[PDB]
Symmetry: D5
Subunit: 131 residues, 10 copies
C-alpha cells in the first residue's frame, strides 16, 4: 500500500498529475459535470461525504493558491461559505456568478462529487506550486 498522500486511488491519480494552475472541483450532489471532465463520485448518501470534510482532505493533500466559488453560496449557504473562507484563510478566494463558475468547470481536470445536499456547495481548487 501507498505510505503517504491522499487515501483515494482515483484522487491520488488526479493530484499526481497536477501542474501549477491546474484546477479540480469539489461539488455538491447537484452540480452538472461538463462533458469530457472526469467525474470521481464519493457520495454514499445524502450529506455524505460532506462538502466540508472533503474540502478539508483536499486542502491537506493539495497545494492550493486559489479557490473559486459561486457568489450564490453566500446567500443560501453561509455555513460552508464561512468554512471555505476559514479553511483557505491565506489563499485567494474569488466569487463568480454560479453561471460563470460552471463555465470555468469546463477547464477542470476532474469534478469530485460529494453527498452535500445544500445549495451552491461547490468550489474550484487551483493548484499552487511547491517551489
Amino acid at each position: 500500500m501507498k505510505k503517504h498522500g491522499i487515501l483515494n486511488s482515483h484522487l491520488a491519480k488526479i493530484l499526481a498529475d497536477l501542474g501549477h494552475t491546474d484546477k479540480i472541483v469539489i461539488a455538491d450532489a447537484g452540480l452538472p459535470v461538463p462533458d469530457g471532465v472526469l467525474k470521481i463520485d464519493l457520495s454514499l448518501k445524502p450529506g455524505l461525504p460532506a462538502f466540508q470534510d472533503t474540502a478539508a482532505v483536499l486542502a491537506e493533500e493539495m497545494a492550493v493558491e486559489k479557490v473559486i466559488a459561486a457568489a450564490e453560496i453566500k446567500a443560501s449557504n453561509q455555513e460552508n461559505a464561512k468554512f471555505l473562507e476559514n479553511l483557505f484563510s491565506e489563499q485567494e478566494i474569488e466569487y463568480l456568478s454560479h453561471e460563470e463558475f460552471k463555465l470555468l468547470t469546463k477547464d477542470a481536470k476532474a469534478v469530485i462529487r460529494t453527498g452535500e445536499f445544500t445549495p451552491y456547495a461547490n468550489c474550484i481548487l487551483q493548484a499552487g506550486v511547491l517551489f
Copy 2:
C-alpha cells in the same frame, strides 16, 4: 437528478446491470482488486467511509440473497463480523478462507473500496431476484 435509488453514480450504474447471482465486493482499504475488475473507490481518509456504513447502504439498495466473507474476519474483527451477521440476518452467510475469498472476487462485477482500516473487513454481496 435521479429521484430514487443509491446516490452514487458509479454504484447506481453497477446495480443497474445486476442480474440474479451477480456479485459485488465491499472492501477495506487493503484488499487487492483483481485485474479486469472495476474499482469504485469511495475512501476519503482512514476509516471513512466505514465498512459498516457502506454495507448498510448497499443492503438498502440491492436485493441480496447471499453474503460471503473471509473466516479470518471472525478472529481479528468481531465488530464488523457481527454487524454483517445482524444486517443480513435473513440472507445466506458463508465464510471461506481469505485466500478462497480473494479467488472469488475475480468474478465480481466491481469492488467498492471503503476507508475501513480493520483486518478482513470485506464481503461479497450476491444479487437476489425481485420475483
Copy 3:
C-alpha cells in the same frame, strides 16, 4: 438486483449522472439523433412503447424542472401535447420550433427512442435539483 429506481439499466445509468440542468430526450420513432448523442432505443414495434408511457416513467424517476417541446406538437398532435401539459403541470413548459428543438437535442445526454408513431411526439426533460 437493484431494488429502487427506474428498471431500465441504460436509463438508470443516464439518470445516475444527471446534474442540475442536464437534459435528456424522449423521442418518437422518427426523430434524428445528433452525432455523439447516446441513443437508447426502447422500441418494440410501431406504437410500442408509447411516448406517453415512457414520459410517465421518466417523470416518476427524474426530477424535472423544465420541459421543452416543438410548437408543432400542439397543432399536429393534440393528444400527446395535452398529455405533456397535464403530466408536467407544475414544470415550466417551453415550446420552440421543431428545427430549434432538434438543434437543442445536440446538448442532450441521451435520446430515448420510443415506438411512438405520431407527429412531433418529442420532448426534452431538463433535470432539476433535490435541494
Copy 4:
C-alpha cells in the same frame, strides 16, 4: 427511415449479422448477462415489455430453427411454456437445467432484456436459414 424489418435499431443490427446457428436471448428482468455479451435492455417498468410480446416480435423478424429454455420454466411458469410450444410449432424445443441454460447464453450474440417479472421466463433463439 428503414422501411421493413424490426423497428428497434439495436435489435435490427443484431439480426443483420445473424448467420445459420447464431443465437440470441430474450430474458426476464433478472437473468444475469455474461461478460462480453451485448445487453439490449428494452425494459420500461416491471412487466413491460412482456416476455411473450417480445418473443413474438422476434419470431416475426427472425428465422428460428430451434428454441432452448430452462426446464424450470414449466414448473415455475406453465403459461409461458405453452406459448413457446405454440409459437414455435415447426421448431425443435429443447429444455435444459437453468444452470446449463445460463452457460449457453455465453455464446449468444446478445441478450434482450424484457421487463418480464416471472421466474425463468428466458429463452434462446437459434437462427435458421432462408435457403
Copy 5:
C-alpha cells in the same frame, strides 16, 4: 437469419438508425469519402454492382423524402440521371454543383461505394418518416 429488410448487414445497421432527414450516399468508384464518414464498399469489379441496381435496392428499403445529385450528371451521364428521376418520381430531386454535392456528403451517415465506372453517378438519399 433476418427475415425482412435489406440483405446487407452493414447497410441494415445504417438504415436501422435512420431518423427523419438523415442522409446516406450511393457513390461511384471514384467519389472521395469525407474523413469520419463510414464507407461501406460493395464493389466487386468495374461496373459491379451498378449504381442503378444499388439505388433500386435502397429505394425499396428506405423511405426517401429527397434526392440530391450533382448537375454534372446531366451532362456526361444522362442514362443514370434519367434512371434516378424515374426511380424517385414523387420525391424531390435537387441538383447542386458537384463541388457543393461533395460538401454535403460530409453530413452523411455513410457512403455506399458501388462499382459504377461512369461520371458523377452519385446521389444523396435524405430519409423521410413513416408517420
Copy 6:
C-alpha cells in the same frame, strides 16, 4: 485512384496483408461468422453478388495454393461444386464436413459474405507465394 488490383477497398486491405498460408472465406448469405473474424459483406440482394462471381474475382487477384469446402456441397449444390473444381482445377481441393469447415473458419483473416442463396456455397482460399 488505385490503378491495379481488386476494386473493393475492404478486400484490397485483406489481400495486402496476405502471407503464405493465410486463409480467406467466401460465404453464402447464411454462413455464420466466428467472433473476432472480420466480415466484409458484399451482398446486395438475394443472389447478388453470386458465389461464383465473387470467387472468380478473388481467384484472379489472390495467389491460391489450396481450396477447402464442405463435402455437403457436392450433393446439395452440384452447380457451385463443379464451378469450384473447374476454377481451381490446378489447386489442391480438400473437402471436410461442414462442421469441420466452420471450425476452420475461426482462423480466417476475414469472411466475405456474398448474396449467394444456395446451401453450402462457401469455401476457403489459402494463400500461396509469388516466389
Copy 7:
C-alpha cells in the same frame, strides 16, 4: 499473396481508399507529419529508399492528376526537381512556398516517409479517376 498492385501492405491500404482528389505525401526524412495524419515510414537508412524510387512506384500504382511541391526544391534540389517534372510530365504541377505546402499536408491521407536526405524532397500526389 496479393497478385497485383503495390507491394507494400500499408501503402496498398492507402491506395485502396483513394477517391478522386484525395491526397498522398511522399516525404524526405525530415518533413514533419501533421498530427492525425498516418505516417508510413519506409526509410531504411540515410538515402534509402530514395524519393525518386518511391515516387516511381506510387506513380505506377496510383492514377495521379496533379502534383504539388515546394518552390524551394527548384533551387535547393534541382536533381529531384527535374525528376518530378519528367516523371509527371503529363500531370499538372503546382509549386507553393514550403510553408503553404506543409499546411496543405494537413489534408493528406498519409505521409510516406522515404530515406531521402536532400532538402525539400517532398511532394503531394492528388488522385485522379479511372473513368
Copy 8:
C-alpha cells in the same frame, strides 16, 4: 500540486492502486517486460537513475512486506545484492532463479525501468498493508 507522496506521477498512480500482496518491479536497463505489463521508464542515461536510488524512494513511499530477487544477483552483483538486504532488513527476502523471477514479473502491476547497467539488478516489491 500534490503535497505528499512519491513525486513521479506515473509511479504515484501505481502506488495509489496497490492492495495487499500486489507487486511491482524495479528493473535494470535490460530486463524484458512481459506483454501487458505497464512499463514506466525513468532512465536518463546509462547508470541513471540507479537501481539503489530508485529502490530507496519506492521503499519510503510503499509498504513492502516481501521482496523477491534473482539468486544470480548475489554472485554477479554483490554491491546491489547487499544493498537490498540492508534496505529491506525487516522484510522477508526470497531469491528465485532469474528465469523464475521473470516468470513472476508477469503478475506485476508495472515494471519501473531504471538506468542501472549492472547484472541482475532487479527486484519485486510485494505490497504490505497499513492495518
Copy 9:
C-alpha cells in the same frame, strides 16, 4: 537491446517521429501539461533528475535548431539561463512571457517532466534537420 541513441524508451519513441520544426518540452516539476500532450515523467524525487542534466542528454540525442524559454527564467533562475545559452551556442534562443510559453507547449509532441524544483526551469526544443 538498442545499440545507439537515447536510453529512455519513451523519449526514443518521441525523437523517432521528430520532423523539422516539431517541438518537445523539458519541464520542472510544476509546469502544467496541456490536455492531449503526452507527458513522460522522469522525476524521481525533488531535484532529480535535474533540468540541466536532462537538457544535456536531449541536446546530445536531438538536432535542435531553436530553443524557447520564459523570460521569467532569467529573473527567477539566472543560472539555468546561462546553461542554455552555453549549451545551445549555435541555436536561436527566444524568450517569451511564461504565459505565451505555456500556450506554446500546446503544440509540443510531449512534455518531459524533470524533478527540477526551480522557478520557470522549462524550455522548448525545436527540432532541426540532418540535411
Copy 10:
C-alpha cells in the same frame, strides 16, 4: 530530428523497448504474420528492400545474442543463408524447421517485412544485453 540510432521511426520504437531476450523478425514478402504481432512493412517493390540490407542495418542498431532461421533456407537460398552466417559470426545461429520457426514468430515483438522475393529469407534476432 533524432541524431543517432536507426532511421526508421517504427523500428526505433521497437528497438527502444527491447529487453534482454526479446525477439523481432526480419521477413521476406511471403512470411505470414501471426495475429497480434505488429507488422512493419518496409517493402517498396519486388526485391526492395533486400533481406540482406535490412538484416545489416538491424545488426548495426541492435545487440543480437542469437539468430534463428529455418533449415529450408540452406536448401533453396544458400546465398542469404551464407550472408546471415557471416553477418552474425560470433552469435549463436540456430536452425529450426520452417514450421517450428513460424511457431516461434508468435512470440516476436514485431515482424519487419522486406521486399525479398527468395525462399525462406526470414530470421529471428533475439536481443542481448549491453552489460
